[PDB]
Each structure stands twice: as C-alpha cells, then as structure tokens.
Write an enzyme that holds these catalytic residues in place. Structure first.
Site, PDB file in Angstrom:
ATOM      1  N   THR A 119      -5.271  14.713  -2.966  1.00 34.54           N
ATOM      2  CA  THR A 119      -6.313  15.617  -3.425  1.00 34.54           C
ATOM      3  C   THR A 119      -7.685  15.043  -3.109  1.00 34.54           C
ATOM      4  OG1 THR A 119      -6.778  14.775  -5.629  1.00 34.54           O
ATOM      5  CG2 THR A 119      -4.745  16.003  -5.318  1.00 34.54           C
ATOM      6  N   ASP A 176       0.843  -1.182   0.000  1.00 35.93           N
ATOM      7  CA  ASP A 176       0.000   0.000   0.000  1.00 35.93           C
ATOM      8  C   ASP A 176       0.885   1.242   0.000  1.00 35.93           C
ATOM      9  OD1 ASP A 176      -2.596   1.417   2.089  1.00 35.93           O
ATOM     10  OD2 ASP A 176      -2.568   1.183  -0.072  1.00 35.93           O
ATOM     11  N   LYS A 177       0.275   2.411   0.036  1.00 36.04           N
ATOM     12  CA  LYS A 177       1.068   3.628   0.071  1.00 36.04           C
ATOM     13  C   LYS A 177       0.860   4.468   1.317  1.00 36.04           C
ATOM     14  CE  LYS A 177       0.044   7.342  -1.062  1.00 36.04           C
ATOM     15  NZ  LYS A 177      -0.741   8.438  -1.657  1.00 36.04           N
ATOM     16  N   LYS A 199     -17.949  14.466  -0.009  1.00 34.25           N
ATOM     17  CA  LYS A 199     -16.510  14.673   0.010  1.00 34.25           C
ATOM     18  C   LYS A 199     -15.815  13.354  -0.269  1.00 34.25           C
ATOM     19  CE  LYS A 199     -14.936  14.328   4.012  1.00 34.25           C
ATOM     20  NZ  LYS A 199     -14.675  14.621   5.438  1.00 34.25           N
ATOM     21  N   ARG A 230      -5.860   4.011  -7.705  1.00 32.36           N
ATOM     22  CA  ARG A 230      -7.311   3.979  -7.549  1.00 32.36           C
ATOM     23  C   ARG A 230      -7.829   2.545  -7.546  1.00 32.36           C
ATOM     24  NH1 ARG A 230      -8.598   8.361  -4.873  1.00 32.36           N
ATOM     25  NH2 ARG A 230      -8.519  10.279  -6.107  1.00 32.36           N
ATOM     26  N   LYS A 245     -14.787   5.265  -1.634  1.00 33.68           N
ATOM     27  CA  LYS A 245     -13.810   6.325  -1.887  1.00 33.68           C
ATOM     28  C   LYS A 245     -14.420   7.710  -1.700  1.00 33.68           C
ATOM     29  CE  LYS A 245     -10.840   3.769  -5.158  1.00 33.68           C
ATOM     30  NZ  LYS A 245     -10.333   3.758  -6.580  1.00 33.68           N
ATOM     31  N   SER A 289     -13.574   2.292   2.154  1.00 36.09           N
ATOM     32  CA  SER A 289     -12.478   2.149   1.210  1.00 36.09           C
ATOM     33  C   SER A 289     -12.945   1.628  -0.136  1.00 36.09           C
ATOM     34  CB  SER A 289     -11.405   1.225   1.772  1.00 36.09           C
ATOM     35  OG  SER A 289     -10.173   1.434   1.108  1.00 36.09           O
ATOM     36  N   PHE A 320     -17.625   6.895   5.371  1.00 39.68           N
ATOM     37  CA  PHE A 320     -16.679   6.602   4.307  1.00 39.68           C
ATOM     38  C   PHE A 320     -16.301   5.131   4.303  1.00 39.68           C
ATOM     39  CE2 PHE A 320     -13.077   6.730   1.615  1.00 39.68           C
ATOM     40  CZ  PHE A 320     -12.096   6.015   2.240  1.00 39.68           C
TER      41      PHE A 320
END
Ligand SMILES: CCCCCCCC/C=C/CCCCCCCC(=O)O[C@@H](COC(=O)CCCCCCCCCCCCCCC)COP(=O)([O-])OCC[N+](C)(C)C
Ligand SMILES: *[C@@H]1O[C@H](CO)[C@@H](O[C@@H]2O[C@H](CO)[C@@H](O[C@H]3O[C@H](CO)[C@@H](O)[C@H](O)[C@@H]3O)[C@H](O)[C@H]2NC(C)=O)[C@H](O)[C@H]1NC(C)=O
Ligand SMILES: *[C@@H]1O[C@H](CO)[C@@H](O[C@@H]2O[C@H](CO)[C@@H](O)[C@H](O)[C@H]2NC(C)=O)[C@H](O)[C@H]1NC(C)=O
Ligand SMILES: *[C@@H]1O[C@H](CO)[C@@H](O[C@@H]2O[C@H](CO)[C@@H](O)[C@H](O)[C@H]2NC(C)=O)[C@H](O)[C@H]1NC(C)=O
Ligand SMILES: Nc1ncnc2c1ncn2[C@@H]1O[C@H](COP(=O)(O)OP(=O)(O)O)[C@@H](O)[C@H]1O
Ligand SMILES: *[C@@H]1O[C@H](CO)[C@@H](O)[C@H](O)[C@H]1NC(C)=O
Ligand SMILES: *[C@@H]1O[C@H](CO)[C@@H](O)[C@H](O)[C@H]1NC(C)=O
Ligand code: ALF
Ligand SMILES: [Mg+2]
Ligand SMILES: [Mg+2]
Lengths: 365, 957
Positions: free
Chosen positions: B428, B192-193, B391, B622, B372, B369, B367
């Site tokens: 972003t 993952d990041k 959002k 993504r 998104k 995962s 929210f």
C-alpha cells in the site's frame, strides 16, 4: 555462460562406500582378529620358548676371581636351556694376571668355563653385552666424521668444522696431526680380546672355532672404505695409544673396511644396554660339553659401575629370546575376544532396533 | 610490493617466527646438533605455498575481515598445544640438569666431560635443545591446511550446479572463501521481504481515489487468506476469475471508447476496475471525475521512470524504472489514459487522453529507504503556482499531513481501505499533494539551492529541507500493488524451520502485508498467537499515558504471562546457555515505532531480547536500515550466536555487513547488496541448499579435521619425549632428519586434508530430506574443547604405544634380526616407531571418515606406501650417512612386522572399541540416519534432489 562443469568430482558424487558398524558386521571382525592374533601369539610363544642362551658378566673378574677355578656368583651368569629347566651347574672363572701390562685399571685374562647341556644349531652368535655405558648422548652420538668413514683424507677443517656430525672434541692432537678415526665414538672402542675359538675342556682334540668375519652386514663395505691418509697426517685417537704406541707407520694404519668390530662399534646402541656381535660360527653345531673362553680384559667399566659380559646364543627368527611379542599377541587376541563378548552381552541385553526412525533425537521428545 | 608485505603478513604468526628462531638457533648459534641447511625445508615450503595463495588472491582481485568461530577456538587449541610443549621442554631441562649433576657415569671416562660448575648451565642448554627437538609439536601446517580446506569448500560452494540460477546466469559466487563452516552453525536468519522472499515484480491491482475503492482481483495471497479463514477457495475463485475476465473485457472496451491513446496496449492491462472508467465518464459526478483525473496525473508524474524505445516496435515505449513500485504505477497510469511518454530537458511531457502537454519538474525529492517516501514539485500555469506531489508509505504520509484541510472522513475511509488491501496482501502507498504559493516556493527553492551546493554531508541538509517543505499535505488517495512469492520459498522456509533455525523477517513494508507474506510463505501458521507489541493510541490510552512505557508494559506482560521469566541478567545468562528450537508456537510482530522504543534503553532491550529468544518467528515491520543493523547486532552480541542476514538493497547492506554470514541476492534492484556480502545466491530457495548441505558438511568437516590434526602431530612429536627417558633427556634425535620433516609434510598431511575437503556423513539428498541433522551444528556438539582434549589424550596414549612397543622388542637383548646382526641404532628404532605411528594415524583418519570414497582411500594408501618407499629410497643411497640400509635391514626382519601389526592393533583398539560401544548403545542421529540409509529408506529419491524446486518430479512415496 557461467554454468559450472557438471562432473562427479565437482558435484561431490565420487563413488564410495558408507561403512556403518552394526553388530552383525563388527562382532565377526572382532572375533576374526581375536582368533588370528591368538593363533599367532601361540606360535610365537612356542617357537620362542625353544631359544637357549648363555649370559655371563665378567666385569668382576679382576677382583672376584682367583688364580684357580672357582664358581661364578649367581648374580653374573644366566643360563636358559629349554630342555633343562633346572640346570644350575654354575660356571667357573679364573684370573691369569698380566704383570707386564702397566694399565692396572684392567689387565690380565679372565678364563670362563661354561657347560651347555644341549646344542646350538649351526649358527652360533657370541655377542658382548655392556650395561650402564651411555652411548646415546647428544655430543657423543654425533662425534665422528663421514669423510673419514667414506675413505677420504679429510683435512682438519673438513673433519672438525663440518656441520652436524663433526669430530669436535677429538679432531687433532697436540703435535698437529688429525686423529685418524676421530671423535668420541671411534676413540672409545671396546677393547677386550675375545678368542678365535671356544677351547673344548672335555676333549681338547676338537675345539669349537669362531670367526670375526661376517659379524657385520656385508652392505656396510660400501660405506666404510680403506683410508687414503699418509701415516704422516694421522695419529691414533688418545685411547688407541696402547694399541699403536709408536704411532702410525707404513703397515699399521687400520683398514676399517674389513675391520668389522669397528663397524659394529660405530653403530651406537640406542639404549643403555649394548649387545654387539663379536664372533660367529656359521658352519658347525655347538655340541653339548664344557667349553672355555679366554677373554683378555682391556676395557675399564667399574669406574661407572658398568657391566660387561658375553652372550652366546643361536637366536631365532624374531631375534633372541624375548617373551614380549607372544605375550602381547595373546593379550591383543584376548582383549579383542573379551570386547566381542562384552558387545554381544550388552547387545543381547539392551539391543536396540537398527534402522528405527523412532529413536531419532527429535522423534523421542 | 608483494614479497615484503607477504612476509610481514605471515610472520605476524607465532609458528612462523618459532620456525625462524629454530633455523637461526641451529645455524647462527649452532651448538652442533642439527642438519641446519635442510632444517628450513618445512618453513620454506609452507611460506612458499602461502605466498602462492596470496598471489592467487591478488590475481583474483586484479581480475570483510570475517573469521569463523572455529578459527578463534583454533587459536585457543594452539595455545594449549604450546603449553604442553613447554611442559615437555621444562621436564627435559630439569631432568637433564639433575642427571649432569650425578657424579659417576660413563661420561667422566669415555666422553671427555667435566662437571661444568652449577650444571644449571647444561640444563639450560638442554631446554633450548629440547625446544628444537620437539619442533613437530608446533602446529605449523595447521593454518595452511585449514586455509586449503576452507578454500576447497568455498570452491565447491561455487561450483555447485544446484546453486546456479540459469535465468540470471548467476552461480552462487562466494565473496569470502573462509567462513564456509559458519553456514553449519547458523541459528538466526534475518531476512528482508520484498526482494528476498517475493520477486520484485509488481502488478498494480487496486486503488482508492477520494475515499472510493476501485479495483478487483482474486490473487494467490487473497486465496490463501480465504483458505485461512475457512471458506473453500476453488469454488469461489472460478466464479471470481470469470467475473474478472468479463470486467476486464468491458473495461478495455470502455477505455477504447473513451479516447484515442497512443501507448494504450490492452494485452497487458493489469488494472481491472470497470467502475474506474465508469466513474471517469459520469457515474459519481464531476468532483469524482476530476479526483480520478488528478490522481492518475499524480501517479504518472511522481516517479523516476526512464523512457526508451522497444527494439521490436519502434513506436513502443518500455518504461524502465529503478523502483518496481514506480514501474507498476506508471504502467497503470499509462493504461488508464494518462500516458507518460518521453522526458524533455525540462520536466516531463504527459499525454492526457490523447493531448500532449509538457510539465515542469523543478525539484525531485528522490526516494530513500530512510525517508520511506518521494515527492516532486511541478509548475501549474496560470501568476503560476507550485504543486508538490508526495508519495510514499501510508504511516509516513499520515504523519506528514495537515489537520485542518482534510475531511477526516476520507482519512478514515482511505485508512480502512489500505488496511483491507494490506491484509489481502498488497503493498500500500499513499499519494498526497501540496499547493504552494510562489513566495513559499521561492523561499524553499533558495533553501534547497544553499543546501545542495553545500559540501560536508549534503544528505542531511537535503533531508531537513525536504522534511520542512513536506510538512503540510492533503491526501487524495492510496494504491495497492501485488507482490508474488518467489519460487520455492514456502518449501525453503519449511526446511529451514525443520533444521531448527529461527527466521526473523525485518521488513520495511506494512505490518499486515508482512503478516500476510508470513502466512503465505509458512513463517507463521494457523493456531499461532501473534504477540503484537504495537504502541498505538487505542491501547495506549488504556495501558498507560505515554509511549516508551506502553512497550515496556507490553513486553513485561507477554513475558510474565507466556513464559515464567522476566527481563533480567539472570534470565539472560540462563538463556545464553540453551540453543534448542523453542516450543510454544508464538510470534512477535513489532512495528518500527515500537522497535525504536524497545531498542532505546538497556533494560528494555534485555526484555525484548528475552521475549524474542522464544517465539520461533519474529516480524519487525516499518524498519529502517539502521534498525535492521541494530536488531542484528543486538541478537548477535547479547546471547552470542551465529547469525545470517539475507537480502538485497542498500538497507540490507547495513543488515548484511553486521552479521556473521551475510548473503546477498541478485535482485531487481541493483547489485549493491551482492557486493558487500559473503555469498551471493540468485534466489531465496538456494538458501536451504547452501545452509543445510554445504554449511553442515563444512562444519562437520572442520570439526573432525582439526582435532585429528592435533592428534597426528602429537603421536610423532611425543615418541621423541619418550625416548628422552633412555638417553637422560640429552637431545639425541630418535628419528632421521628427513623423517622429522617429511612426517608433517607428506607422510600424514593428505589424509587429514581430504577428510576436511571431501567428507560427507550423508549425501545431499538425505541432508535435505532429514534436515534435522543440522541441529547438532546449531547446538555446537561437534566441536568443543573437550573433544580436542580427548583427541590429545588418545594421541598421548598412542605415542606411548608407538614408542614402547619397539623399545620392548629391543630391551631384552637388543637383537631383533633373524641373522644376529645389529639393528640397535636409534635411527632404526626410529624407523620402527615411525612406521607404527604413521600407519596408526592414517588408519585413525580412515576410521573416522564417514564416507570412504576412492579418492580419500587412494591417498591414504599412498601416504602409507610413501613412508615405506621413502625409507627404501633414502636408505639405498650412501648420502644417508648412518642410515645406509635401514630399508633392507629393517623391512627384512620378521620382528619389524610382528611389532608393526600388534602395535597398530593396540593403537586402534581403544578408540575403535569406544566407537563401537557408541554406535551400538548411544547412536547419534547421523548414525541412525545412516543405518536407515543402509536399509534403503532413501532409495526412491533421485540423485540431485531439491525439494525447493517447483518443477520437480513428484516423489514416489
Ligand atoms: C593432489 C596431489 C597433491 C597436491 C598437493 C596438496 C594440495 C592439496 C590439494 C587440494 C585440491 C582441492 C581442489 C578443490 C577442487 C575445486 C573444484 C571446483 O569446485 O571448481 C569449480 C570452480 O572452480 C573455481 O572456482 C576455482 C577457484 C580457485 C580457488 C582454489 C581452488 C582449489 C583450492 C585448493 C588450494 C588452493 C591452492 C593452494 C596451493 C596448492 C568448477 O570450476 P570450472 O568447472 O572450471 O568452471 C569453469 C566454467 N566456466 C568457465 C564457464 C565458468
Ligand atoms: C682399551 O681401551 C681402554 C679404554 O677405551 C684404554 O684405556 C685408556 O688408556 C689410556 C692410555 O692408554 C688412558 O689415558 C689416560 O690415562 C691416564 C689418566 O690419568 C693418564 O696418565 C694418561 O696420560 C692418559 O691421560 C685412559 O684413561 C684409558 N681409558 C680410561 C677410560 O681410563 C686402553 O688403553 C685400551 N687398550 C688397548 C690395548 O687398546
Ligand atoms: C684346542 O685348544 C687348545 C688350547 O688352545 C690347544 O691346546 C694347546 O696346544 C698347543 C700346541 O702346542 C700347546 O702349546 C698348548 O699347551 C695347548 N694348551 C692346552 C690347554 O692344551 C689344542 O691344540 C687345540 N686343538 C687342536 C686340535 O689343536
Ligand atoms: C666356515 O666355513 C667357511 C668356508 O666353508 C670358512 O670361510 C673361510 O674362512 C677362511 C679363514 O681364513 C677364509 O680365508 C676364506 O676366505 C673363507 N671362505 C669363504 C668362502 O668365506 C669359515 O672360516 C668357517 N667358519 C668357521 C667359524 O670355522
Ligand atoms: N518508488 C517509491 N516511491 C514511493 N514510495 C515507495 C517507493 N518504493 C517503496 N516505497 C515505499 O517504501 C516502503 C518500503 O520501503 P523500503 O524501506 O524499501 O521497504 P522494502 O524492503 O519493503 O522495499 C513501502 O511501504 C513503500 O510504500
Ligand atoms: C667376591 O665375591 C664374593 C661372593 O659374592 C663377594 O662377597 C665379595 O664381595 C667379592 N669380592 C669383592 C672384592 O667384591
Ligand atoms: C708399523 O707399526 C707397527 C706398530 O703397530 C710395527 O709393529 C711395525 O713394525 C711398523 N712397520 C714398519 C715397517 O716399521
Ligand atoms: F529486499 Al528489498 F527492496 F527490501 F529488495
Ligand atoms: Mg527497485
Ligand atoms: Mg525498496
């Protein structure tokens, strides 16, 4: 907190060496092993060539020997005297039949005359040899009772129903008595009567005397014990019924503690050849001369083509005469020397650089 | 229920049931030849040890079924060993039948034997007694020794102090204590990041409100991008930080002059835009003033932040959040003058530039995962209205937008601004709102109630009602948050790329942010072609007409252009064979939309996998948790390889479970990926340490310890077969029973177990300095079946030597004593054989150890001394029936020692000469590194060396 204990063991930093086998360190080890093994092989082969022995097979004495002295065929005797490499002087044998004994399979007395052109220093062993007698089979080699060896008066079930080593086929006769030395190991003993001396044929005033004491380890008298049976609970094994015809009574039950030929026989030879000591002389040198051995044939060996013989020797430190240990020490030393020379040749031919970070498999591609 | 469950779990094995059958065949169906009572001590002891280890596991659980590759190959080697044992038993039975058929022998006279008609019956009983004779050729302690070795290696992974993260107080806790040899064959790493490579601590930097860009910050990723471009970094950065400090000071002054804010604390204001407060007053007009106000209000409302008290200041509020994104957003919203304080029983209470007015949060579309995004519905007072503030990700929000009610100028301007911020390296977001009428909200609310009250997977019902309600939105702006790399991730990824490991990054964040982090953490470098597989319309219009074909064309084009292959099973079968680290310096960057298409069909999956088998780096962006798991399963199933999957979170959970060695990181998000994982490090930088040092060691250890085990069993158990030749394969044992049991119990176990536990080719410092030594594990050179077969052949030759050297010392005249007395018993010949065998196998283990530590050497010496001492202790007792003084009779005979030394030389000369020829003329990389270590090229590195630590002393050279 939860921080692990820092210690040379749990951090895997035990003191250690890291032996890399470079040529400058392995080739000297190769040469050292080569020289040591070649020296030891030379010494063993030297001290073993000096061993002298006499082997004679007399299984064919009932049918090939006559009533007068005749030479033994060359296929029977085998003399080895190092000082005399060309000493044939075949032995002679003569059969003195015994018409009273009704066991016609083997009876009588085989008289053997050999000639030793040198001495045997001060410790002379006279073994007997048996070939093609199989004493390593599964049922035979386990057919004895260590309750009777150790002296106890083992009842029928302790002797016959025991686990592992149990005298199963020879546990009890028809009358209901326990065969005292039970099992096929004791029952099938070697029966020839070797003499208590080597009759000197030349000068009969001094015969060479042999004993049957000290032919087995002295520490075996802690394991073999005089039985505590009662001459009414035991009978001899089925094949000891020429030795004990009237059975056991007050004075004939054998004391298997001092009976050292029994303690030799109850140690079954691992292989197909069987060499068991039967007479020793730890006092006198056996001088050169022509001697005579009066063997009283009892034990049948021709029904299975087996051989039986004598083997008179003085021995060595490494046993009898066997060229194997010296041969294989020399072969080991010569192989190590050849490998050291081969590594040295290839290392002076295609010798690479030792700590060369340019030979690594990724710095070459 | 302990005992029945344990005994069942064990006798699910064939060695345990083989030994049980041996005990029953020697006892209940007793032919007579056995010591049946003690013939169970091996099985009983090993089953007791296993039950104790299971009790240890049960106590640890009182305080997922993964199997290493060497375990499956170990089962195959066990099967080959059983085939050999059956061949031995078959030859024994055949030859014993053939012999019992012969019609003149010593047994028709002295052994009371008859020809039992059709002696095949005796040959059959001979086979069944040979099965019990060669009870040592079965690997019985193999499984308990491998479990001991694996558990000790996992305990060292745990107790390592360079894998302990002192901040979180978290040592690298192995959750699975039996796959530690997979870390030495790891070939792919799926990472993952935002929590793995970058610490999940966010600082809100820039934002775009109503198409107007705000914010200024010269961050480390921006400096890296400038260096990549070419302009010098320090010269510009000094001036930029000077201007930023000036701007921050003026902005704090202006925020203080604007109004009185309670929770306004200028000591941690991270938003630096002077123009933002300059526009709040009058700069860009009342429309822009209201736009900025509404944007910050949306930021301060749409979240899940809990409010609590500071233990230091009773008035201060902490803003604890589950999502660091929300934490950063709310922090900046409070700093600019829209402080979010408290959370009443209904909605939230917001202080707007000093005045507190309560809001009503009716629905919180939390929210996911997979969504998104997130949204919440708030009541607007007056007939009141509804406002859905949405959002989330920019691509998701752009998909869920209205076509008519948007300027299409703000659209493209915000898109360009988010592209700029993401290329700079910031996360972003997009913020959108929906104005809802009362009737529409009442309709949707009753739908939401009838969906939520439902049982039977309410998740999909909530998802569908939210996807229905959020379909219409109007964009008001986007934000950008900065994510800093972890300490020592560039160094760790450099190590793991030198070691030949291919690192795939499965993000969920933007393509440009992922590429920026790749360049920053050294996944990608300059002069590297980024083979992007975007199915985006601007190139779709030229490539073809419709997607699911544009990606096919792109994959085929990149294949046929950059390499000489095409997607085909021939190419896949040819690529399954090679494991070399590719050359060509390429990288795939495939968005999630293109990943879906590339994973749909089998032919396109084959194409995508052949393209990604090259290309050292891959960046899937993504990506949803399902797609994470799918990519891992694809690369692990096709072109079967070893994969590692590291991360944290509920999505990396599905990526972690679907891989060979899954590693979870204790991150800012809850420890849900740590639980469903195999190890658990505190930070990413420990992956290099773990993998290289511990996994490479454990692979080398097991790969040497297993063939050694088969060889050491074979020597001893085959000298009995050799003896069979000289008693006609009849079944008399050459060895004492205590010898037969103690061999594999005590005489030979600890050397091979310590070779498996404590062996090191090169230490940790050199394992991390020359990390390329890992490539042998990656390539599978240490453990083949050819290596096991060579070890079995050496064991067979050494068994020949061990038997026929004592046999050849006897065979001439059976007199081997100095005093002519007898040693001809088969137990004494077996002492000869056994002493040779044990010393040769122990010295083999010693010569094949890389490191000679005092522990390993001490226990090798003790195994040899134990052979001699057990003989000396069991002889001198009359309880040994026929073995009563084998000690004093054999060890006092010079023939014993002559044979001993030359037979050990002949056992170890072929293998030692082969090792010498190798280490001289074809030395492996570890042998060259050890010859460099000996001369001391690695003398200036400290003992505990970690090149993946920022606060480390700079090395001398
Ligand atoms: C030798 C004579 C003949 C023996 C017979 C032959 C047997 C072969 C022998 C084999 C010996 C192998 C020993 C391994 C060394 C482990 C060292 C280690 O890393 O400990 C570390 C972790 O400690 C743990 O996590 C322990 C976990 C228990 C699992 C089993 C460990 C040993 C496995 C072996 C097999 C399992 C048993 C199977 C049944 C035998 C450090 O622990 P600590 O410092 O204490 O940290 C406490 C600090 N704290 C409290 C703040 C947190
Ligand atoms: C010396 O040992 C000899 C062998 O160990 C032993 O020979 C055995 O003698 C017994 C009888 O003395 C024979 O027993 C059987 O003999 C025939 C066989 O059909 C039967 O008529 C008998 O009833 C009995 O079943 C054995 O056959 C014989 N051994 C062999 C191998 O044939 C000598 O008796 C021993 N002699 C001394 C003096 O100890
Ligand atoms: C050496 O052995 C021989 C043979 O056993 C002994 O000679 C025998 O002596 C007895 C004694 O009366 C005679 O009955 C025999 O006729 C003799 N046989 C032979 C072949 O001579 C001789 O006595 C022994 N040596 C000594 C010193 O007694
Ligand atoms: C060698 O000499 C020893 C004594 O020096 C002899 O041993 C004795 O033999 C007699 C024979 O019956 C025994 O009664 C004695 O008890 C023995 N004494 C000892 C101390 O052992 C031995 O017999 C001689 N050997 C030969 C072959 O003549
Ligand atoms: N609390 C949040 N609210 C709204 N959007 C979020 C939140 N957290 C993450 N996101 C969005 O989700 C996307 C990443 O989601 P996720 O699947 O968690 O990826 P990652 O592995 O990068 O966290 C990002 O583009 C981010 O904008
Ligand atoms: C006696 O010995 C001779 C000489 O070897 C041999 O030819 C003959 O066969 C022997 N006699 C018997 C009955 O075996
Ligand atoms: C005991 O038996 C033996 C048979 O070997 C016999 O010679 C001896 O006379 C017997 N003893 C007595 C007292 O009857
Ligand atoms: F690794 Al994450 F949220 F993607 F912690
Ligand atoms: Mg979070
Ligand atoms: Mg996330």
């Amino acid at each position: 907190n939860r921080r692990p204990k820092e210690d040379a063991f749990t951090q895997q930093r035990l003191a250690a060496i890291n032996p890399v086998l470079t040529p400058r360190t392995v080739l000297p080890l190769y040469l050292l092993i080569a020289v040591v093994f070649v020296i030891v092989g030379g010494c063993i082969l030297a001290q073993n060539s000096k061993v002298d022995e006499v082997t004679i097979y007399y299984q064919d004495c009932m049918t090939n020997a006559t009533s007068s002295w005749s030479d033994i065929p060359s296929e029977h005797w085998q003399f080895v005297f190092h000082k005399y490499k060309t000493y044939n002087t075949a032995p002679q044998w003569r059969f003195v039949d015994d018409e009273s004994d009704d066991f016609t399979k083997q009876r009588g007395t085989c008289q053997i005359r050999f000639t030793t052109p040198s001495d045997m220093k001060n410790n002379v062993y006279l073994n007997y040899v048996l070939e093609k007698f199989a004493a390593n089979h599964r049922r035979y080699v386990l057919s004895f009772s260590e309750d009777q060896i150790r002296g106890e008066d083992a009842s029928y079930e302790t002797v016959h129903d025991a686990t592992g080593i149990n005298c199963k086929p020879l546990s009890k006769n028809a009358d209901g008595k326990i065969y005292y030395p039970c099992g096929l190991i004791a029952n099938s003993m070697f029966n020839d009567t070797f003499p208590l001396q080597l009759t000197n044929v030349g000068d009969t005033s001094n015969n060479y005397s042999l004993t049957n004491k000290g032919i087995n380890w002295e520490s075996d008298k802690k394991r073999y014990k005089k039985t505590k049976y009662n001459y009414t609970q035991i009978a001899p094994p089925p094949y000891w019924e020429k030795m004990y015809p009237d059975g056991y009574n007050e004075t004939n039950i054998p004391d298997i503690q001092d009976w050292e030929e029994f303690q030799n026989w109850m140690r079954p030879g691992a292989f197909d050849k069987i060499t068991k000591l039967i007479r020793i002389n730890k006092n006198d040198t056996l001088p050169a001369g022509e001697y005579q051995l009066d063997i009283g044939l009892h034990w049948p060996v021709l029904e299975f083509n087996g051989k039986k013989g004598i083997y008179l020797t003085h021995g060595s430190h490494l046993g009898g005469r066997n060229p194997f240990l010296g041969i294989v020490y020399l072969i080991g030393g010569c192989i190590c020397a050849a490998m050291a020379l081969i590594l040295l040749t290839f290392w002076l031919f295609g010798g690479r650089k030792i700590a060369d970070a340019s030979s690594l498999s990724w710095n070459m591609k | 229920t302990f005992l029945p469950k344990n005994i069942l779990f064990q006798f699910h094995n064939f060695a345990n049931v083989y030994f049980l059958v041996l005990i029953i065949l020697g006892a209940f169906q007793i032919f007579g030849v056995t010591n049946p009572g003690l013939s169970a001590v091996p099985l009983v002891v090993i089953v007791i040890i296993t039950a104790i280890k299971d009790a240890i596991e049960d106590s640890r659980r009182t305080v997922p079924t993964k199997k290493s590759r060497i375990s499956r190959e170990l089962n195959f080697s066990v099967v080959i060993n059983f085939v050999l044992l059956f061949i031995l038993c078959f030859v024994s039975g055949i030859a014993n039948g053939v012999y019992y058929d012969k019609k003149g022998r010593s047994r028709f006279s002295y052994e009371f034997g008859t020809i039992a008609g059709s002696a095949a019956t005796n040959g059959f009983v001979s086979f069944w007694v040979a099965v019990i004779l060669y009870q040592s050729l079965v690997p019985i302690s193999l499984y308990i020794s491998v479990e001991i070795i694996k558990t000790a290696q996992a305990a060292f992974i745990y107790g390592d102090v360079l894998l302990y993260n002192a901040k979180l107080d978290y040592p690298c806790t192995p959750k699975s204590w039996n796959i530690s040899d997979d870390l030495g064959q790891v070939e792919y790493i799926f990472s993952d990041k935002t929590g793995t490579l970058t610490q999940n601590v966010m600082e809100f930097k820039k934002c775009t409100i109503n198409g107007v860009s705000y914010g200024r910050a010269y961050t480390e990723a921006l400096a890296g991008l400038r260096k990549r471009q070419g302009i010098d970094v320090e010269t510009e950065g000094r001036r930029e930080k000077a201007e930023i400090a000036k701007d921050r000071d003026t902005m704090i002054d202006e925020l203080r002059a604007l109004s009185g804010n309670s929770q306004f604390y200028p000591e941690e204001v991270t938003f630096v835009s002077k123009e933002f407060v300059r526009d709040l007053k009058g700069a860009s007009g009342e429309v822009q003033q209201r736009c900025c106000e509404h944007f910050m209000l949306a930021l301060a409302l749409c979240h899940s932040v809990l409010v609590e008290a500071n233990p230091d200041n009773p008035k201060k509020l902490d803003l604890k959040a589950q999502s660091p994104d929300e934490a950063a957003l709310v922090a900046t919203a409070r700093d600019v003058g829209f402080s979010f304080v408290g959370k009443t029983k209904k909605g939230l209470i917001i202080e707007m530039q000093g005045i507190q007015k309560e809001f009503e949060i009716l629905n919180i579309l939390e929210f996911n995962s997979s969504r998104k995004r997130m949204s919440c519905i708030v009541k607007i007072p007056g007939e009141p209205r509804a406002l859905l503030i949405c959002k989330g990700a920019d691509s998701i929000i752009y998909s869920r937008l209205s076509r008519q009610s948007n300027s299409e100028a703000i659209l493209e301007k915000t898109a360009l601004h988010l592209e700029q911020y993401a290329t700079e390296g910031l996360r972003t977001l997009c913020i959108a709102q929906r104005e809802l009428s009362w009737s529409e909200y009442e309709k949707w609310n009753e739908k939401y109630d009838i969906a939520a009250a439902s049982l039977a997977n309410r998740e999909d019902e909530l998802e569908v009602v939210a996807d229905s309600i959020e379909r219409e939105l109007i964009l008001l702006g986007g934000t950008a948050i900065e994510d800093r790399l972890q300490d020592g991730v560039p160094d760790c990824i450099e190590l793991l790329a030198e070691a030949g490991i291919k690192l795939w990054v499965l993000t969920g964040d933007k393509v440009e942010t992922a590429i920026n982090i790749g360049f920053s953490c050294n996944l990608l470098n300059n002069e590297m072609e980024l083979l992007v597989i975007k199915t985006t319309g601007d190139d779709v219009k030229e490539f073809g007409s419709e997607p699911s074909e544009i990606v096919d064309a792109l994959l085929s084009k990149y294949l046929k252009e950059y390499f000489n292959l095409t997607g085909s099973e021939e190419e896949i079968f040819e690529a399954k064979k090679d494991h070399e680290f590719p050359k060509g310096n390429y990288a795939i960057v495939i968005d999630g939309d293109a990943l879906k298409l590339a994973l749909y069909g089998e032919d396109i999956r084959r194409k995508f996998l052949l393209l990604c088998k090259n290309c050292r780096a891959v960046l899937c962006c993504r990506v949803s948790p399902s797609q994470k798991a799918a990519v891992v399963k694809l690369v692990k199933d096709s072109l079967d390889v070893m994969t590692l999957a590291i991360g944290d979170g509920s999505n990396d959970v599905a990526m972690i479970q679907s891989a060979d060695v899954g590693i979870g990181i204790a991150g800012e998000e809850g420890r849900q990926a740590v639980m469903c994982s195999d190890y658990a490090i505190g930070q990413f930088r420990y992956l290099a340490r773990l993998v290289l040092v511990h996994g490479r060691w454990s692979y080398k250890r097991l790969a040497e310890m297993i063939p050694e085990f088969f060889y050491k069993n074979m020597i001893f158990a085959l000298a009995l077969f050799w003896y069979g030749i000289y008693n006609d394969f009849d079944g008399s044992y050459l060895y004492e029973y205590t010898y037969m049991m103690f061999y594999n119990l005590a005489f030979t176990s600890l050397p091979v177990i310590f070779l498996g536990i404590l062996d090191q080719d090169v230490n940790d410092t050199i394992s991390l300095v020359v990390p390329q030594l890992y490539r042998v594990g990656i390539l599978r050179k240490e453990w083949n079946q050819r290596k096991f077969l060579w070890y079995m052949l050496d064991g067979l030759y050494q068994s020949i030597i061990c038997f026929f050297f004592p046999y050849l010392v006897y065979h001439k005249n059976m007199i081997v004593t100095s005093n002519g007395l007898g040693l001809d018993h088969r137990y004494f010949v077996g002492v000869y054989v056994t002493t040779i065998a044990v010393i040769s196998c122990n010295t083999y283990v010693l010569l094949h150890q890389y490191r000679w530590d005092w522990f390993s050497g001490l226990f090798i010496a003790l195994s040899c001394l134990v052979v001699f001492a057990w003989t000396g202790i069991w002889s001198s007792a009359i309880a040994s029936r026929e073995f009563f003084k084998a000690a004093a009779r054999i060890y006092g005979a010079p023939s014993f020692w002559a044979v001993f030394f030359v037979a050990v030389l002949f056992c170890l000369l072929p293998r030692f000469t082969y090792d010498s020829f190798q280490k001289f003329f074809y030395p492996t990389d570890v042998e060259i590194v050890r010859e460099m270590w000996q001369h001391g090229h690695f003398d200036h590195y400290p003992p505990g060396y970690d090149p993946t630590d920022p606060n480390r002393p700079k090395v001398t050279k």
